[PDB]
Amino acid sequence: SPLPWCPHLVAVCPIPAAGLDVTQPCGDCGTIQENWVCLSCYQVYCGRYINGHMLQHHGNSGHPLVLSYIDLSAWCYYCQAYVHHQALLDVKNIAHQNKF
């Protein structure tokens, strides 16, 4: 199971009214693969197995929690774990509707 809570959920920000585009490419390298969206600032960057731009974004912003456009899991870089909570249901659901 993911963690049912983490102390960084307070940094999850409201979903843009434009919604989410789960096919949006990495904002740095343009890859279509393994992208995540930041749940603070809603920038999209690639995963560790591509070019690691979301990890870079975490390092230079401190933003904690990111949502996968592959499986709609949410990862906290500080807690080094997946997290699921009601504060994440709306954003997951918007991504699920856009994806599927």
Ligand X SMILES: Cn1c(=O)c(CCC(=O)O)nc2ccccc21
Q: If binding is defined by CB under 6 A, does position 75 make contact with ligand X?
A: yes
Q: For Zn ion, which stretch binds (CB under 5 A), given 11-19, 21-29, 67-75, 90-98?
A: 21-29
d(C-alpha 17, C-alpha 96), whole Å: 16
Q: For ligand X, which stretch binds (CB under 6 A), given 2-10, 21-29, 48-56, 86-94?
A: 48-56
d(C-alpha 97, C-alpha 76), whole Å: 23
User: Residues 6 or more apart from 75 whose CB is under 8 A from it?
Assistant: 36, 65, 66, 68, 81, 82, 83
Q: If binding is defined by CB under 6 A, does position 47 make contact with ligand X?
A: yes
Binding site for ligand X (CB under 6 A): 36, 47-48, 54-55, 66, 75
